[PDB]
Design a protein around this nucleic acid. Structure first.
Ligand SMILES: [K+]
Ligand SMILES: [K+]
Ligand SMILES: [K+]
Ligand SMILES: [Mg+2]
Ligand SMILES: [Mg+2]
Ligand SMILES: [Mg+2]
Ligand SMILES: [Mg+2]
Ligand SMILES: [Mg+2]
Ligand SMILES: [Mg+2]
Ligand SMILES: [Mg+2]
Ligand SMILES: [Mg+2]
Ligand SMILES: [Mg+2]
Ligand SMILES: [Mg+2]
Ligand SMILES: [Mg+2]
Ligand SMILES: [Mg+2]
Ligand SMILES: [Mg+2]
Ligand SMILES: [Mg+2]
Ligand SMILES: [Mg+2]
Ligand SMILES: [Mg+2]
Ligand SMILES: [Mg+2]
Ligand SMILES: [Mg+2]
Ligand SMILES: [Mg+2]
Ligand SMILES: [Mg+2]
Ligand SMILES: [Mg+2]
Ligand SMILES: [Mg+2]
Ligand SMILES: [Mg+2]
Ligand SMILES: [Mg+2]
Ligand SMILES: [Mg+2]
Ligand SMILES: [Mg+2]
Ligand SMILES: [Mg+2]
Ligand SMILES: [Mg+2]
Ligand SMILES: [Mg+2]
Ligand SMILES: [Mg+2]
Ligand SMILES: [Mg+2]
Ligand SMILES: [Mg+2]
Ligand SMILES: [Mg+2]
Ligand SMILES: [Mg+2]
Ligand SMILES: [Mg+2]
Lengths: 116, 137, 208, 96, 23, 86
RNA sequence: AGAGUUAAAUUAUAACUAAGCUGUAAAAAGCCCUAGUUAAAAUAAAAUAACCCACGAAAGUGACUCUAAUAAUCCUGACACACGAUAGCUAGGACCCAAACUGGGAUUAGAUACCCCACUAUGCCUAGCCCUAAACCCAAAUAGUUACAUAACAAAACUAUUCGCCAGAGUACUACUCGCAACUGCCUAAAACUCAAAGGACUUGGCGGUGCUUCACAUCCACCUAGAGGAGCCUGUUCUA
């Protein structure tokens, strides 16, 4: 449930001292904020480290590191595939919640009335 | 297959023995993951130390030792020294919050050591020493 | 670009058209290629349907070209393949019974195998953070690795060769050296691995 | 709304009930006023911005021979009539 | 904003607190 | 220090995976708010900043939980409009 | 306001193992009498409950328990009486930890600053003093009305009784004077002189080493090829003449 907004803000007819001092007025806007892009992180680290172990153990020659080298290539392709497809599908995937453009139109049909 | 997250209470008698020994008999792996270093120590059920390893002792130096990879290598090294003394399962206790928590956990997994229980014992003062001031970077 | 967005890259392989009845999905692909009435670009002058060509040779031939002398670049690539063939033929003659069926006399097999050993596995890209540049390793893509191997071959045989020794013979020597994993190009490939392994803790800086 | 308090008979479980006795008195004058302006050859415009009866209201005006505007209302229609419609335009004498 | 007056009163007090210290 | 060990903030792995068990532990701490608490105890915040932080956390929790209700309340009005081109 | 009490953390201290430990965007300095684990006083501070809004006149108060306890049969009122965070002073006691000043390291043209390490006054208890705050909810107390009515902005507008305060800006939380356990202090508080403005709110534009999202196909980075700056010569400027 929503926290009570009774006797919180600084008002003339308020005996209780202020509890909340908002930066901007608590008025619902007719639009929601855009989704925030997820910050990236380095990929293929658990596979690069094991690759470096074989290189240091065999004088930097891939004559015996073939198993590790291929997985590093596989991880690079796997990370490449996911990175070059996340942006397009996430816009309309919606995770069950309408994209920001649809919510803005929905809110405009039923706007908030501060005046009158 | 009813599996309970909570540990088997010592007071009761739970028929869950790993490698022929009880829950409390299994050694402990302490992980102190600070913001600049990761220290791993394995101790016996009687709190007798078996092996010790950290990002500093593995060749990593200065800023490098605070990264995740350094903690991952320390986990591999600590497990190898522990496995040499003949330990299969260990109850890992994580101390503090840092960038090396995840790497050290899987470092023991890939080093030839098996974990069964995870505990977080971060120092949480209940009101305690006054910490240092803020950094106006 | 005089070609509009509708034009596409032509298909040159003759075998792709002569045996289409053995597959169904591929049949739908090219039957709609003209049913959509999509325009086709003119055939490039370099690529041809001759069975004696090879895509890796054409790219290597183009890079050797300086200015606009395609004839000279093709002439140099012809002699280099001949020079490699002559050396391997001579070595085959002066060999024992077990050594005879070891030497490869196919320059195309040697050329393809040589470049696959000069390709670095992990590269470096500078990243600026905190007012300083840190060399951060990255998983270079296959096209970049293939291109980087060719550039190293050309760079080495153009700079540190003697003035008397001709280009076709100097490049032939390095191809055999790279075929045995002992050429200076292989040394340069390992040197890039040395720097990448040294900065293995800086991989966290990159954000992709 | 605050101005509709006199016209409300009461509220039934949070639902307002409009006093039809005052509705009948108002509707009697409204229909009487509507007919007289139609008797004198007056232009009557049906305005209703509601997307459930737009077709019904549009067809209703056609049968009566009068005009209807149930579409989007432009800003300068009734005020800046000469620019929107034409040089000399006769403004409607009644709006419903 | 009113900060144009607090700063003016800040400098005067800061200079007065050095006139006392010097003499 | 005085309580029994290996009872509080402890989870047990199942079927031999450890990444899944660790994520369960983090959800336990995040829901109880310890993760943010440890972040704020690395340095010291003056009581002036503590109240100013609780006046921004509470205000956000009111606006977010009120805009959330309106979205759910108006969620049913997203079907295809039956009066298109009316 | 007294009296009694301690959960979580930390430290003296002991045992064991390890050779390093702290620290940053990156380092150095410092430490190696150290770090990890187990066992553990004193001092200090009071996770979650708190998305609650209670008590007091205000400043303030939110770990537990007990004792004492929150004026007026319920208006206004000072220069009088009582009180007043934090910093600061005097005397004694405590000191985990934080920490002005100071010393070292780094950065910088300089850095007696931001950043890192060490440590003191002090923050704490008992007794006394000082009586200052953006002591601001910038909105005085007691009764009321939602009528009349939008400068702007903000926290909508107003009536009755009463007290305090306000007469351009700078000079000025200053000079002189009275009182004060104050003596580099607090309160009270001008003038000579200078200017024709100072000031509140708003509008558009520009800008932002402000945040969010998107984008640079010769393009800012990543990245491709050929060149300039090096030599002679040709030609064009500056200077010399
Ligand atoms: K407490
Ligand atoms: K603007
Ligand atoms: K030139
Ligand atoms: Mg009160
Ligand atoms: Mg504001
Ligand atoms: Mg002044
Ligand atoms: Mg204790
Ligand atoms: Mg007391
Ligand atoms: Mg040093
Ligand atoms: Mg110690
Ligand atoms: Mg002591
Ligand atoms: Mg409160
Ligand atoms: Mg009172
Ligand atoms: Mg009372
Ligand atoms: Mg009185
Ligand atoms: Mg005081
Ligand atoms: Mg004090
Ligand atoms: Mg004091
Ligand atoms: Mg004194
Ligand atoms: Mg003293
Ligand atoms: Mg001290
Ligand atoms: Mg200290
Ligand atoms: Mg200094
Ligand atoms: Mg206050
Ligand atoms: Mg005031
Ligand atoms: Mg007041
Ligand atoms: Mg008063
Ligand atoms: Mg009273
Ligand atoms: Mg009142
Ligand atoms: Mg206006
Ligand atoms: Mg006046
Ligand atoms: Mg004056
Ligand atoms: Mg003052
Ligand atoms: Mg004075
Ligand atoms: Mg350019
Ligand atoms: Mg040239
Ligand atoms: Mg030149
Ligand atoms: Mg010249």
């Amino acid at each position: 449930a929503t926290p009570s907004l009774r006797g919180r803000l600084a008002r003339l007819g308020n005996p209780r001292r202020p509890i909340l001092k908002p930066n901007k007025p608590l008025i619902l806007a007719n639009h929601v904020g855009e989704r925030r892009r997820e910050k990236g992180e380095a990929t293929c680290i658990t596979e690069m480290s094991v690759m470096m172990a074989c290189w240091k153990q065999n004088e930097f020659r891939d004559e015996a590191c073939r198993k590790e080298i291929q997985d590093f290539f596989d991880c690079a392709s796997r990370a490449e595939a996911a990175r070059k497809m996340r942006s397009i599908q996430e816009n309309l995937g919606e995770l069950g919640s309408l994209p920001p453009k649809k919510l803005n139109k929905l809110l405009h049909r039923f706007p908030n009335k501060p005046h009158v | 297959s009813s599996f309970s997250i909570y540990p088997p209470i010592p007071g009761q008698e739970n028929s869950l023995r790993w490698a022929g020994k009880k829950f409390e008999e299994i050694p402990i792996a302490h992980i102190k993951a600070s913001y600049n270093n990761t220290q791993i120590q394995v101790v016996s059920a009687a709190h007798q130390p078996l092996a010790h390893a950290s990002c500093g002792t593995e060749g990593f130096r200065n800023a490098k030792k605070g990264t995740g990879i350094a903690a991952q290598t320390a986990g591999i090294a600590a497990a190898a020294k522990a496995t040499g003394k003949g330990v299969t399962h260990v109850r890992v206790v994580v101390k503090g919050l840092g960038p090396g928590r995840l790497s050290a956990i899987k470092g023991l997994t890939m080093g030839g050591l098996e974990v069964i229980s995870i505990t977080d014992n971060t120092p949480i003062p209940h009101x305690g020493c006054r910490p240092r001031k803020a950094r106006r970077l | 670009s005089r070609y509009g967005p509708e034009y596409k890259d032509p298909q040159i392989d003759k075998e792709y058209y002569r045996k289409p009845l053995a597959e169904q999905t591929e049949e739908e692909k090219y039957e709609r290629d003209f049913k959509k009435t999509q325009l086709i670009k003119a055939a490039p002058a370099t690529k041809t349907s001759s069975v004696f060509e090879d895509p890796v040779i054409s790219k290597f031939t183009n890079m050797m070209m300086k200015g606009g002398n395609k004839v000279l670049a093709r002439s140099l690539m012809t002699q280099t393949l001949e020079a490699v063939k002559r050396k391997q033929f001579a070595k085959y003659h002066a060999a024992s019974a077990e050594e005879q069926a070891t030497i490869e006399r196919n320059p195309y097999t040697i050329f393809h195998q040589a470049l696959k050993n000069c390709e670095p596995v992990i590269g470096l890209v500078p990243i600026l953070k905190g007012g300083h540049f840190y060399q951060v390793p990255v998983p270079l893509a296959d096209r970049r690795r293939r291109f980087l191997a060719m550039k190293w071959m050309i760079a080495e045989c153009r700079e540190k060769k003697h003035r008397r020794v001709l280009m076709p013979e100097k490049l032939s020597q390095e191809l055999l050296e790279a075929f045995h994993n002992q050429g200076p190009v292989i040394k340069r490939k390992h040197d890039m691995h040395k720097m990448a392994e040294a900065n293995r803790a800086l991989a966290h800086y990159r954000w992709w | 709304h605050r101005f509709m308090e006199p016209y409300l008979f009461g509220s039934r479980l949070g639902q307002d009930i409009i006093d039809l006795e005052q509705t009948a008195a108002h509707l009697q004058l409204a229909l009487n006023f509507t007919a007289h302006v139609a008797y004198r050859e007056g232009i009557i415009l049906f305005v209703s911005r509601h997307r459930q009866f737009a077709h019904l209201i549009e067809t209703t005006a056609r049968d009566c021979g009068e005009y209807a505007h149930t579409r989007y209302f432009k800003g300068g229609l009734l005020t800046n009539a000469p620019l929107l419609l034409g040089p000399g335009v006769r403004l409607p004498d009644l709006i419903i | 904003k009113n900060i144009l007056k607090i700063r003016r009163r800040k400098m005067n007090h800061h200079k007065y607190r050095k006139l006392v210290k010097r003499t | 220090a005085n309580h029994l060990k290996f009872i509080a903030r402890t989870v047990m792995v199942q079927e031999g995976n450890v990444e899944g068990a660790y994520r369960t532990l983090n959800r336990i701490l995040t829901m109880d708010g310890l993760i943010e608490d440890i972040k704020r105890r690395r340095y010291y915040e003056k009581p002036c900043r503590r109240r100013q932080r609780e006046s921004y956390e509470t205000c956000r929790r009111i606006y977010n939980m009120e805009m959330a209700r309106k979205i759910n309340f108006l969620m049913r009005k997203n079907r295809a409009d039956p009066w298109q081109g009316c």
